[PDB]
Symmetry: D2
Subunit: 268 residues, 4 copies
C-alpha cells in the first residue's frame, strides 16, 4: 500500500549518495516502486553507491550526449523489466555546465562550445530521454525533471540559469508529445540542496565570491520560506517527485511544481 | 492505507452534488480521511446532499460574512472531533459574485457594494477561515483553496477574475501566518467544471453572449490541454486537492497547483 | 517639440510636493502637456502645492468614493478644457489602506470594512475613473495607473499588496473597455519612493518592525537593481509615465511597465 | 527635436525591406538618430536595401558566429563614427533556427547540432554583441533585442520557442553587466509580423499544417488584442524599440516590453 505500489520507474542522475536522484530512488522504493537506474560514465562507482538503496535495481549506462546509447535505451530497459512490461515513470535528474559557464568566471567569457555542452546535457536531453522512452511508457505515466527557478538572474549561476530557462520551455513541448501517449511531463523546482559539489563551491571551488554568494542565497532562502528550508535534507524534494509519479496529480502537465519551502512566493 | 488515513479534515463549500467540494469530500473519505463539513444557509438541503457521501460527517453552519460564526467555529469543530484532537486539513471551496459583477452586465456598471461582497466571500474569507482554524491545526497540516487562473482577462468572468487575483495574493500572506504553525497554504487552479450554475450560465442565465463565450472557453481549454480536459469530471481536481492535503508535497506553500489539463502552459 | 506637445492630460493624486503625481505633472508640463488636476478633500492645500508647478492648471475636486463627483467629472473636465476638446491622457495616482491593513498590525486582524475601503480607493477606482473619462478621450489616448509589484508577499505591506493584485487585474479589464475607444490602459510598477508618509513609516508610524522592514527592502532594492535605485528621486518614474502617455508605446495595453531599476528581474 | 536627436545607434538584422530592423532603422532616422548598420553574408543585397532608408548609414559585416568579426567589431564601429565618439544604442534583431527545428518536422527529430546553431545565433549572440559593444557605449545607453513571448508552448515554433526562452534569460544577465556601464538592456516582445519568410511559411514552406497553425495564431492574436493587431505593420514595434532607445524609460532594465496589441494580457 505504498504510493507507487506496482509502478515501474526509470531513475537517472545518481552519481553519489548526496545526489538528489539517490533520494528520489530511495523514497520511490520505500513506496513500492520497482526501479531501473541509469548512470553516466563511472558505472562501478554508481553500482557501489546504489547497493545502499533499500532494494536491488538494474543499472544501465546512459550518456545523454551519446546517440547510440539513446537509440538502444528502450530495448535495454525492456530487457531489464521483461518483455510485455512498460514503464510508469521516468525521472530526469541530470545537469551539467562547464566551469567557464558558472562561478566567478565572467558571464561574457564563456565560449559557446562550453555553453552548448551545458545546454545539451541540462535541457535538450529532457527531450532526448522522452523521445527514447515514451514508446515504452504506459498511459497514466509520468515524466519528471529537476529545475532550479531561473525566472530571475542571480550571481554565479550564470549560464546554468540560461540552461534551466531552456529546460522549462522544453518541458512544455515534451508535454505536447507525451500527451499523445496519455503521459504527463512536469518539472520540480527545488530549493538549494547541499550536495557534494555545492559544498565544494561554498568552499571556493568556482572562486571565493561565488562561494560567498551561494551562502547568502542559502541563508536568504530559509529566511524567505514560510515553512523554512533545510538545504541538508533532500527528502521533501524526493517526496514531491514521487507525488508527481503517483496517480494523485492526474491533471497537471507542462508545468512546474515548486518544492522550495515557498520561498519563490515571498520577496523578503 | 489510504492517502489521508487518520487525518481530520474540514471541508467547506458543498451546496449540491455537483459542487467541487462534494467530490473533494468523497475522494478524501475514500482515502481514509475523517471529515467535518461546513455549509452556508440551506443546512437541510446540504445534509440531504451529504447523506450520499461514503461516510458520515458532522455538518456545521458557516456564513463567512458572519463574524459570530467565525468566532465560534474552532469551538464547534473541537466539539465535533473531540477535545484534544486537532485538524490536519482545511478546504476552502467558497466563491460568490453578484450577477452585476459577471456575465453580459458591463464591467463598468457593477456597483462597488456588489464587488465588495464578492471579494469578501471569495478572497477575504480565505484569511478569515485560516484565522479561525490555525489555532486548532496540527503541525504538518494543510490549508487548500480553489482558484481559477486570473493572470489574463477574459470575457464575462469580469469581477470574479479580480476576486481571484485578490485570493492569490491573500494565499501568499496566509502562508506566512500558517508557517508559524507548521502549516502549508496553497491554491488549486482548476479548469472549468460544469457545475449546476455553469450549465445555467451556458443556457443563458447571465446573458446569451456570456453563455456563448463560456462554451468557447470550454472547447478551447480541452484543445489546448495536452492531456485533454473533461469539464464533466471533477475527480482529477479532487485528487489534486487530496495530494496537497497529504504528506507528499511537504515543501510547497504560498503556491498554486494547476489541475487544468496543462492548458495554461499552451497558447494554442 | 516636447514629448507631449499639444496633449491634454488629467492628473490625479497630488497631495504634497513629494507625491509621485506632483512629479508626473511637472515632467508632463516640461514636455508640453496641458493639464487638468484632480484633488481629494484638502483643495486649498493642493492648490498651494500645485502653484509651484511650471504652468497653471485647473484643479477639480474628486473623491473617488463619491458617486456624484464621478458622475459630474467629465462635464467639469470639459468645462475646464473647452467644449469640443477631449483628453489625450489620464493618470491615476491614487492609493489608500487604513492602518489596520498595513504595518505591524496583524494581517488577520484587519476588519473587512477597512480592507474594502482600501480596495475601493486603490483598485476599483481605476475602473471608476476610466468609466467617467473614456467618453471624453481621443483615439490614441492613454490611461496610466501606479502599481507596486504584488507578485510576492512581503512584510508590512499586507492588505495593500492584495489591493495592488486586484488593481493589476482591473487594469486588464479596463484595457478591454478602453480599446473600444482606441485608448490604451497600463500600469507603471515603481520601486519604493520616499514620500512624506514613507519617511513617517520608516520613523515608526506603523510600528517599529514595519519601519525596519521597509528600510531593509529599500536597501535590497538598490542592491538588486542592475542600474541602481534612488528612492529619493521620482523623476525616472515620472518619465516612464510620460513615455506611456506619448505616442511611442502604441501597441502596449493591459500591461505593466516596471520603473524599478530592474530589481524585479534579479533574485539577488 | 526628434526622439533620438544626436544619438549614435548600431542596428543589426536588416536583410530585406520587410525586416523588422529595416523599420527600426527607418523610424530611428526619422527621429534624428545617426546609424551604423550591421549585416550578415549578403552585403551587396543589404546595401541596396538600405539605400532606401531616409539617410545614409555605414554598413559593417557581422556574422555573430564568427569570433573574428566580433573581436574586430568595436574598432570598425569606432572607425565609422569617429575616434572619441561612442554609441548610445544597440539593436539586436537577429534570429535563426534550421528548418528541422521548426514547422511540421517533429520536435523530437531536431538534431542537437541544429538546435545549437539556432540557440547560438538567436540567444548567445545577444551576450556576444553586448560584450563587443559595451566598451564603446556611453552612460545612459540602451541595448534592445527582439523577442517573441515563449512563456507557453505553441505549434510549429518548436525549438525557436526554446531559443527565445534562453534569450529572455540571457537578457537578465546582460543587464547585470551593462549596468556597470550605466547601460540598460531590454527586449521587445512583438506580436506576429508578416515578413517575407512568414508569408513563405503561411504558403507552406515548413509544411501545410504549420502554415495553417500560424494563420490561426495571427487571427487569434488580433482578436485577443484589445487595440487590435496588424501583422502587416511593423511601425508600432519600431516605435517601441525607439522608446527604449530614448531617455524616457531610464529605470527599466533586464526586462521585456510587450508590443503586441495587449494580446498576452487576454485569454480570449
Ligand atoms: N543541488 C541543488 O541545489 C539543485 C537544486 C535544484 C535543481 N537541481 C537539479 O537537480 C538535478 C540533479 O542535480 P544534483 O544536485 O543531484 O547533482 P548531481 O551531480 O548529483 O547530479 C547530476 C547528474 O547528472 C549526470 N550527468 C552529467 N552529465 C551527464 C551525461 N552526459 N549523461 C547523463 N548523465 C549526466 C551526473 O552523472 C550526475 O549523476 C540537476 O538537474 C540539477 O540541475 C539541483
Ligand atoms: N466551477 C468551476 O468551473 C470552477 C473552476 C475553478 C475554480 N472554481 C472555484 O471552486 C470553488 C467552488 O465552486 P463550485 O464551482 O464548486 O461552485 P459551488 O456553487 O458548488 O460552490 C460555491 C460555494 O460557496 C458557498 N458560499 C457562498 N456564499 C457563502 C458564504 N457567505 N459563506 C460560506 N459559503 C458560501 C456556496 O454555498 C457554495 O457551497 C469556488 O472557489 C470557485 O470559484 C470553480
Ligand atoms: N511611494 C511609493 O513607494 C510607491 C511605489 C509604487 C507605487 N506607488 C503608488 O503611487 C500612487 C501614489 O502614491 P504616492 O506614494 O505618491 O502617495 P500620495 O499619498 O502622495 O498619493 C496618494 C494619493 O491618493 C489620494 N487619495 C486617497 N484617497 C482618495 C480618494 N478618496 N479619492 C481620491 N484620491 C484619493 C491622496 O489624496 C493622494 O493624493 C499610489 O497608487 C501608490 O500606491 C507608490
Ligand atoms: N517576424 C515576427 O513575427 C517576429 C515576432 C517577434 C520577434 N521577432 C524577432 O525579430 C528579429 C528579426 O526577425 P525578422 O522577423 O525581422 O526576420 P529577418 O529574417 O528579417 O531578420 C533576421 C535577421 O537575422 C540575421 N542573421 C541570421 N543569421 C545571422 C548571423 N549568423 N549573424 C548575424 N545576423 C544573422 C539575418 O540576416 C536577418 O537579417 C528576430 O529576433 C525574430 O526572432 C520576429
Ligand atoms: C544556486 C547557485 C548559485 Cl547562486 C551559484 C552557483 C551554483 C548554484 N547552485 C547550483 O549550481 C545547483 C543547482 C544546479 O542546477 N546544480 C547543478 C548540479 C549538477 C551540475 C550542474 C549544476 C547545482
Ligand atoms: C470561466 C467563466 C467565464 Cl469565461 C464566464 C462566466 C463564468 C465562468 N466560470 C465560473 O464562473 C466558474 C469559475 C468560478 O469561479 N465559479 C464560481 C462558482 C461559485 C459562484 C461564483 C463563481 C464558477
Ligand atoms: C513597500 C512597503 C512595505 Cl514593505 C511596507 C509598508 C509600506 C510599503 N510601501 C508603501 O506603502 C508605498 C507603496 C504604496 O502603495 N504606497 C501607498 C501610498 C499612498 C497610501 C497607501 C500606500 C506607499
Ligand atoms: C509564431 C510562429 C509559429 Cl506559431 C510557427 C512558425 C513560425 C512562427 N513565427 C516566426 O517564426 C517568427 C517569429 C520569429 O522568431 N521569427 C524568426 C525570424 C528570423 C528567422 C527565425 C524565425 C519569425
Amino acid at each position: 500500500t505504498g504510493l507507487l505500489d506496482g509502478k515501474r520507474i526509470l531513475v537517472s542522475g545518481i552519481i553519489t549518495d548526496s545526489s538528489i536522484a539517490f533520494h528520489i530512488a530511495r523514497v520511490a522504493q520505500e513506496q513500492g516502486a520497482q526501479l531501473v537506474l541509469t548512470g553516466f560514465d563511472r558505472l562501478r562507482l554508481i553500482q557501489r553507491i546504489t547497493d545502499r538503496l533499500p532494494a536491488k535495481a538494474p543499472l544501465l549506462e546512459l550518456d545523454v550526449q551519446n546517440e547510440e546509447h539513446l537509440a538502444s535505451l528502450a530495448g535495454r530497459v525492456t530487457e531489464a523489466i521483461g518483455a510485455g512490461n512498460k514503464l510508469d515513470g521516468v525521472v530526469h535528474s541530470i545537469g551539467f555546465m562547464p566551469q567557464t559557464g558558472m562561478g566567478i568566471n565572467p558571464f561574457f567569457d564563456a565560449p559557446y562550445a562550453d555553453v552548448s555542452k551545458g545546454i545539451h546535457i541540462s535541457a535538450y536531453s529532457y527531450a532526448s530521454m522522452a523521445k527514447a522512452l515514451l514508446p515504452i511508457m504506459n498511459p497514466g505515466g509520468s515524466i519528471v525533471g529537476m529545475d532550479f527557478d531561473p525566472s530571475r538572474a542571480m550571481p554565479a549561476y550564470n549560464w546554468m540559469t540560461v540552461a534551466k530557462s531552456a529546460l522549462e520551455s522544453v518541458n512544455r513541448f515534451v508535454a505536447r508529445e507525451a500527451g499523445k501517449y496519455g503521459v504527463r511531463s512536469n518539472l520540480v523546482a527545488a530549493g538549494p540542496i547541499r550536495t557534494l559539489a555545492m559544498s565544494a563551491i561554498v568552499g571556493g571551488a568556482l572562486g571565493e565570491e561565488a562561494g560567498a554568494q551561494i551562502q547568502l542565497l542559502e541563508e536568504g532562502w530559509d529566511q524567505r520560506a514560510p515553512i523554512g528550508w533545510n538545504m541538508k535534507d533532500a527528502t521533501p524534494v524526493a517526496k514531491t517527485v514521487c507525488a508527481l509519479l503517483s496517480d494523485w496529480l492526474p491533471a497537471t502537465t507542462g508545468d512546474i511544481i515548486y518544492a522550495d519551502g515557498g520561498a519563490h512566493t515571498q520577496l523578503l
